[PDB]
Design a binder for this molecule. Structure first.
Ligand SMILES: Nc1ncnc2c1ncn2[C@@H]1O[C@H](COP(=O)(O)OP(=O)(O)OP(=O)(O)O)[C@@H](O)[C@H]1O
Ligand SMILES: Nc1ncnc2c1ncn2[C@@H]1O[C@H](COP(=O)(O)OP(=O)(O)OP(=O)(O)O)[C@@H](O)[C@H]1O
Ligand SMILES: [Mg+2]
Ligand SMILES: [Mg+2]
Lengths: 483, 468, 53, 479, 128
């Protein structure tokens, strides 16, 4: 029983195996019934196997054989446009996966030396995100909020926006998207894939699915294999964006496994090393230097808070790990503010370095006006009289708040974001009725695309507003506001 | 046959020792002879030393250590097919309507794998319920998954019976109702109402199958009856190829039942005492309910909310599994606003401008904006009162109050104890009425004219009756 | 006469405001006590489960 | 060692016993010192006995012997007028119990098919409850409120009212009353028995007492054995009413047992199955079909909330199990509005099927009026119609006040609710409304006794009867 | 201090501070695997601080004449007076000298909150 063992007991997805003396920690084993398992616990007289399937198959006396393999997943460009399970098996119903290689799930993150400072934007196409909380390539931007607030909507719009560049020739701009569905029901993933294919965003995307019915070890293991899939692009000089929807459900799966292995519980019964889990997952997102081919991997963790409680264990862990947060709130959602981002709580710690120079230029004072507006609104609510300057603050802030509204699956290019933020911040909207802002935007862009196309072309190709462009933009805004 | 001896009995849990070393596989059904007839136990774990730990599907009282156990050689299996229509079935599949054996040619195990990813089918067709708040702010989807959330005594049961009454006849396919740990009185009431309205017909063709594991049952039964309901519904979906309504009341009782046995099975308790396996157990159950390319299942589920705490792990984890949600609230109920649906927390996938059109979406979004403003002004209204509000805030609060009261509606089922005649409202009529209310056309109507009526026509008529 | 009526009305309005706020304080004191007990119970349950592993 | 065992250990009310091989699960066992227990855990080589008594009475090494009976209690009509402990031993000191049989403490509630719709009234004699929250025979209606708000007063007046029929000759109308005091002070139960004996309500009542000092298992068990006692009336075609005062204290005792068994604490430290405790208890309240003998067992659980929190764990559980709720509000009780029914939260889902037809006629559309009056009060916190509504609602509420131990027959309630809804009280000062009733009824007994007898016998107001009631009411009100 | 107390002398003892003693006692008890109580403190922490503080005493003439005066220090996190250990000690002692952070940062020092501070021995000890 050096390379084999036999089951002492089995239940609730855990098997206890006698023997397997030479097994490595976290090595895979195969039961004689054909179900596979992973040896999480090595103990003086036992091995604790967590099963990748129904424990109906395993029974006491079942013979167990070493695989000699740590978890690994196929990787390469052949996975693009495919849906794969936690171990890289195709589940979309199409042909096999043409792997360029295989990579272990648990892998050391790049150290201090390989990396380079984050300086390339991840253009989400969302006005609020790109203007106030920029995301850079190699950044780890948390998306956090209550149920049904728009977290997946934000990540999905970020994925959909990349179609502008993924059809181009410049391999340095193209961003390949991996989406990891953890604990979601398979029908939600099917709707997601039809959304991607309808917008034709699937041909550059990858879906890793560990849905609700799949054994707890697979829901645990999906983020790591998805990270290994994304890391091929990083390590071969390409760019990847990995969305972990949702890491809280992965933490729940690990709580299940750890509790059934009888590892000592911690706060809220989570195991004592869940921070080690999410940290060793998220540190793999990095921006590499020229010596390493300048590739990158960007992470967008999704965290579902309960009742807005950010003090909970996992929320605090991931907030303290990530490089910033996008906070979504239900109150803003029903007030009609979509994507409902709380721009006061949201923070990007990479900051303006990740922002397109044009949008940095025009968006500079937007943050100040919105902060002042949020401070002042209490005066209007409290029934107090308003000073002239506070009234001006309200008229500005309400229209800026209206201007950040955006419909689902309708991302904007930065050539389209810059004019809007410019017009709003310079106060050229202050005269328009608050109801008509949505009419303004749709018209103003239509105006610029028709009568001022040179400005949009130059903004896109240069990415920066020279004085001539800014003056022409001023003239165009004044022209159209004199509708 | 394979036989064993009972060695331990604790609550619903029984340990069986098999001297014949070929142990029964997990989930196998085991049988003990008793004066009641057979007692059925389900294998849950293998403990080692030829001992298996099992969950009793009925009361363990009267068991004696050393009592003989027979292995059935398979999981709990229940009748399927059209022979189950018009009949009431026990958890272990026995009839309890006292009309004799169920003569189905096939009998299927209650434990089965969910459909694969490739088998999923998705659609965006509105299921008109006739209920103003649902049809306006949280439309239901045919072939989708629907969940009522609500604490004790808010009206989950009356809402479920209203949905049954409205939708069963219009559906025209087959139906399955699974009572999971809910009131036996209401099981009898549903049975007699169905038998009187002809959807059940003891002398002819019936279109609904009933399964009941009501709340008087031990946790072992409550933890499995839902799977029997699922098995009959899945047989209709896959083998008959029909379209199926699947009602479950109350699915939380499934999760709760597992918790009751979780400690006895030797697991370390999870947060607030739930079993570690809560998430995966509920996934394994609920994602069998999905519609597939073989057929459509439109499942309506009632979810209990312990202590009105929506953050409780069970409701919180159940939220992830639904296309439409209807959060009943005690706060709304105390206002007398039945059916007590929370118009802001209630949410649906199909409230999408591409599905319901731009007009419906605009009306619903404006309604929710008005209601959210009114809720944001609650503290000010309480402390300073109406006078100090901005004038347009006064107007918004008045329209929000009228919208609140206009979302109430009398169901025919509640007529027994409300005394208000039942009322039903079409979707287009609802949208038109709320668009009219938003546009200020009825600002001059007193707000009590909006309470417990259906359609703006009844609002004006009640305005006349209040003016008299 | 208008000035006198204004000041009298403001007196009465602030009186009503204070009384309403006092009622709200009573309600939230009740809710606070309930939350206090719940927090203590939950933390203690976590500790006890940790001990009895 | 097959029919006997020896105590291995004793502690926290649990005795671990060695032997008792042939013991049945939940069997009742007798210890050497005479204290009894339930064999709750059957384990390899040992048994866990929950002690129905203080563990001072049990020592290591003491012999324990089987009884061969699942825990059961005497039942029958010989228990009428008796006070018994949780196991049916008489404690009133009046001698042995003439049991018609024995029934297990815990029994499966009747299923879906045996039952019938609830269609007969439990006459409480309280204007507010009979009018706004009808209770039917076979219903299970929660009485919930803060401490000292009249919960036991409501249940006790309901028990007292049955004297009108239990003195008669027709068992189709009689209603035998069982009352469990769980965790209550023993002096309180003694005084309650005295109160029943004063009003002669004892000769048809049964009291099952597990008072505060008694071991937790007895407090846990008492509701189940009292339910078994009432189920004898249910199953033999008779009608019974069972009051649980309180179920909350039963839940506390069960929490004591479960935590001393070291089972995981759940929400509010209650065990996970605290729901099943009340569910399998209250589902036994049922109305049986003609094939099953037409008997019934009505239940009136009593729940004590802290600070009026109906959202707490146990309150919400019992609200989930019961057919309705009567919410007794401390704020109303302090203002002298007694029986203090909060008509906004109180609901009876059985509703009209349980109500007397005459009350359904006169009390029609009254449930809405009082909540509308409360909304009018909130709005004021005036339009002429709202002023009229306020005036009538105040005086209706004055009609809904009622003194303790003074139930009214429906023949007496109907004239008053008629005068209220039809607005005759609107001309009479509030302070005199309490006099009005006393005078008004006294008039109808004095000069219109035929009308009251007709209301009693027929149960409905025909056009002639309704117009006669109108005429008499107007004649008095003008007088 | 009790040596001075017993031998007819007067002693003052300052416990700076009892919160950290309670923390250390919690550490000992949890690492000895004794059953935890509220907030993971041991089952008998009240019997820690009472056992300590009741030794401060004023002895009658028959027992010599001696005094031991205790000024325990307690650190309230965020100024929370209702915490467990502060709740114990506040009931244990014969009064409070309560120091408020707001007064301290206003420059009002020693910053004693006179409203909350009380001496239950009070005027009996005060200089005439
Ligand atoms: N920008 C938007 N405009 C309009 N509706 C939106 C927008 N973003 C999201 N929604 C709607 O909000 C609802 C929730 O969206 P989504 O599924 O992205 O949320 P989520 O926070 O990821 O939810 P969950 O926790 O259920 O997975 C859906 O109705 C979606 O249509
Ligand atoms: N209708 C009534 N009129 C006058 N006094 C009443 C009325 N109902 C109850 N009381 C009095 O109110 C007090 C409390 O009544 P009761 O004992 O029935 O309340 P409770 O809710 O059962 O109390 P507890 O929680 O202490 O058991 C007693 O003095 C009782 O006499
Ligand atoms: Mg989502
Ligand atoms: Mg009482």
């Amino acid at each position: 029983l050096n390379e084999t063992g036999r089951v002492l007991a089995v239940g609730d997805g855990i098997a206890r195996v006698f023997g397997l003396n030479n097994i490595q920690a976290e090595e895979l084993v195969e039961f004689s019934s054909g179900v596979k398992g992973m040896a999480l616990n090595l103990e003086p007289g036992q091995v604790g196997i967590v099963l990748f399937g129904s424990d109906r198959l395993v029974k006491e006396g079942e013979l167990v054989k070493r695989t000699g393999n740590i978890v690994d997943v196929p990787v390469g460009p052949g996975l693009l446009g495919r849906v794969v399970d936690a171990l890289g098996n195709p589940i979309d119903g199409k042909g096999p996966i043409d792997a360029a290689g295989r990579s272990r799930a648990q892998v050391k993150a790049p150290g201090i030396l390989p990396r380079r400072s984050v300086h390339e934007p991840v253009q989400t196409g969302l006005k609020a995100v790109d203007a106030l909380v920029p995301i850079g390539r190699g950044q780890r931007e948390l998306i956090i909020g209550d149920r049904q607030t728009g977290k997946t909507a934000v990540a999905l719009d970020t994925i959909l926006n990349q179609k502008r560049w993924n059809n181009g020739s410049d391999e340095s701009k193209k961003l390949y998207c991996v989406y990891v569905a953890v604990g979601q029901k398979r029908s939600t993933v099917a709707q997601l894939v039809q959304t991607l294919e309808q917008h034709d965003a699937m041909k550059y995307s990858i879906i890793v699915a560990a849905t609700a019915s799949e054994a707890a070890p697979l829901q645990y293991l999906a983020p790591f294999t998805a990270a290994s899939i994304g890391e091929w692009f990083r390590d071969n000089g390409k760019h990847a964006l990995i969305v972990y929807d949702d890491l809280s459900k992965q933490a729940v799966a690990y709580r299940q496994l750890s509790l059934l292995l009888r590892r000592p519980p911690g706060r809220e019964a989570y195991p004592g090393d869940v921070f080690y889990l999410h940290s060793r997952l998220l540190e793999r997102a990095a921006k590499l230097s020229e010596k390493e081919g300048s590739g990158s991997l960007t992470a967008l963790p999704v965290i579902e808070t309960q009742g807005g409680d950010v003090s909970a264990y996992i929320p605090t862990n991931v907030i303290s790990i990530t490089d910033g947060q996008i906070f979504l709130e239900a109150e803003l959602f029903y007030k009609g503010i979509r994507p409902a981002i709380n721009v006061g709580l949201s923070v990007s710690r990479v900051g303006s370095a990740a922002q397109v120079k044009a949008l940095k230029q025009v968006a500079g004072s937007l943050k100040l006006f919105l902060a002042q507006y949020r401070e002042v609104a209490a005066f209007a609510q409290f029934g107090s009289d308003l000073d002239a300057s506070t009234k001006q603050t309200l008229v500005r802030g309400e229209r800026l708040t209206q201007l950040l509204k955006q419909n689902q699956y309708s991302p904007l290019a930065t050539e389209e974001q810059v004019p809007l933020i410019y017009a709003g911040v310079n106060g050229h909207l202050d005269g328009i009725e608050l109801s008509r802002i949505g009419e303004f935007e749709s018209s103003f862009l239509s105006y610029l695309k028709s009568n001022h196309n040179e400005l949009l072309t130059e903004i896109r190709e240069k990415g920066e507003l020279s004085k001539e462009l800014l003056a022409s933009l001023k003239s165009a805004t004044e022209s159209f506001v004199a509708t | 046959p394979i036989t064993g001896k009972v060695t331990a009995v604790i609550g619903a849990i029984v340990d069986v020792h098999f001297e014949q070393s070929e142990l029964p596989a997990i989930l196998n059904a085991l049988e003990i002879k008793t004066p009641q007839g057979k007692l059925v136990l389900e294998v849950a774990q293998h403990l080692g030393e030829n001992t298996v730990r099992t969950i009793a599907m009925d009361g363990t009282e009267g068991l004696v250590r050393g009592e003989k156990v027979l292995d059935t050689g398979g999981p709990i299996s229940v009748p399927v097919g059209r022979e189950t229509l018009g009949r009431i079935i026990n958890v272990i599949g026995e009839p309890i309507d006292e009309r004799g054996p169920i003569k189905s040619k096939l009998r299927k195990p209650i434990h089965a794998d969910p459909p694969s990813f490739a088998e999923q089918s998705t659609s965006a067709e509105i299921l008109e319920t006739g209920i103003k708040v649902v049809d306006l702010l949280a439309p239901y989807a045919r072939g989708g998954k629907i969940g009522l959330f609500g604490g004790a005594g808010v009206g989950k049961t009356v809402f479920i019976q209203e949905l049954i009454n409205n939708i069963a006849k219009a559906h025209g396919g087959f139906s399955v109702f699974t009572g999971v740990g809910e009131r036996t009185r209401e099981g009898n009431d549903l049975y007699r109402e169905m038998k009187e309205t002809g959807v059940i017909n003891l002398e002819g063709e019936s279109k609904v199958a009933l399964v009941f594991g009501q709340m008087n049952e031990p946790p072992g039964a409550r933890a499995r009856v839902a799977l029997t309901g699922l098995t009959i519904a899945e047989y209709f979906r896959d083998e008959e190829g029909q379209d199926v309504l699947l009602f479950i009341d109350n699915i939380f009782r499934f999760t709760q039942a597992g918790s009751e046995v979780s400690a006895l099975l030797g697991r370390i308790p999870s947060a607030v005492g739930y079993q570690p396996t809560l998430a995966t157990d509920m996934g394994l159950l609920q994602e069998r309910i999905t519609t597939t390319k073989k057929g459509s299942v439109t499942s309506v589920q009632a979810v209990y909310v312990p202590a009105d705490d929506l953050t409780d792990p069970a409701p919180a984890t159940t939220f992830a599994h639904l296309d439409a949600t209807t959060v009943l609230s005690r706060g709304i109920s105390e206002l007398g606003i039945y059916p007590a649906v929370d118009p802001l927390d209630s949410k649906s996938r199909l409230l999408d401008a591409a599905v319901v059109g731009q007009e419906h979406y605009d009306v619903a979004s404006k309604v929710q904006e008005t209601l959210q403003t009114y809720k944001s002004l609650q503290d000010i209204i309480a402390i300073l009162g109406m006078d100090e509000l901005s004038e347009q805030d006064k107007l918004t609060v008045e329209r929000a109050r009228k919208i609140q009261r206009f979302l109430s509606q009398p169901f025919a089922v509640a007529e027994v104890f409300t005394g208000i005649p039942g009322k039903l409202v079409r979707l287009k009529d609802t949208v038109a009425s709320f668009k009219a209310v938003l546009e200020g056309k009825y600002d001059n109507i007193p707000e009590h004219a909006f309470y417990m009526v259906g359609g703006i026509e009844d609002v004006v008529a009640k305005a006349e009756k209040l003016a008299a | 006469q208008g000035y006198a009526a204004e000041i009298s009305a403001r007196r009465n309005a602030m009186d009503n405001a204070s009384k309403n706020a006092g009622d709200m304080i009573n309600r939230y004191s009740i809710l606070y006590n309930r939350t206090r007990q719940a927090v203590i119970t939950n933390e203690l349950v976590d500790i006890i489960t940790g001990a009895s592993s």
